């Protein structure tokens, strides 16, 4: 499916250019509009990446998060600095469907089985670059999550031969990709690959395309 999603620094709605990052450009301090139309084009998912929340958990953007939460009909993604068990309590009581795990976290398995054993696999989102630069591939991964029911990866950034592989390797995870989307023939592509969801950001919010569009290029 298409899931629309938006990086957020103190309730302004910005752009990154992610690395092993940096901001570009803002777009606004008005994230509700921009996601209710999202969800009014047929969207299922929406996506936020609380980048405040990032590099310090103190500045969360709890208030904002709910705001956003509670202005859709539609369940929504949170990432970015859920390194606690706290912090996906906080977030999934501020009404958040997915809390997306930092790769921080991983370094503590036996911490992060336990939030899956408690929340379920359903409510968590673990994140990959695929692996974590300590490395942690993604075979590594999957053998460690499986037994707690590990369900849901987020892999960031021509990769549509990988996506081919992984998505027939493991048929019980649902991957989520992200990034690489700047034109609507990139939606294309992964149309087949065996991907059930694809993170679109800058390309709405540069006007390259629609939800709409998005959408009916993905169901085609
Ligand atoms: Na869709
Ligand atoms: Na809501």
Request: charged fraction near 20%; proline fraction near 4%; aromatic fraction near 6%.
């Amino acid at each position: 499916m298409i899931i629309p999603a938006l990086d957020l620094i103190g309730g302004t709605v910005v752009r990154v250019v992610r690395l092993h990052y940096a901001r570009l450009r803002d777009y606004g301090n008005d994230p509700l509009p921009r996601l209710q139309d999202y969800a009014a084009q047929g969207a299922g998912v929406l996506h936020l990446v609380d980048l405040t929340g990032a590099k310090d958990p103190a500045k969360r953007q709890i208030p904002l998060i709910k705001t956003l939460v509670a202005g859709v009909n539609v369940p929504v993604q949170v990432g970015g600095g859920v390194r606690t068990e706290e912090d996906v309590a906080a977030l999934l009581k501020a009404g958040v469907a997915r809390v997306v795990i930092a790769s921080t976290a991983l370094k503590s398995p036996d911490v992060v089985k336990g939030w899956f054993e408690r929340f379920g696999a359903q409510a968590l989102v673990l994140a990959l670059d695929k692996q974590v630069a300590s490395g942690v591939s993604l075979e590594q991964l999957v053998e460690t999550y499986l037994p707690v029911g590990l369900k849901h990866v987020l892999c960031t950034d021509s990769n549509v031969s990988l996506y081919e592989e992984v998505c027939a390797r493991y048929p019980q995870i649902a991957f989520q990709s992200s990034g690489g989307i700047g034109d609507i023939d990139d939606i294309a592509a992964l149309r087949g690959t065996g991907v059930r969801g694809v993170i679109v950001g800058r390309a709405l919010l540069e006007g390259k395309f629609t939800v709409k569009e998005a959408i009916q290029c993905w169901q085609n």
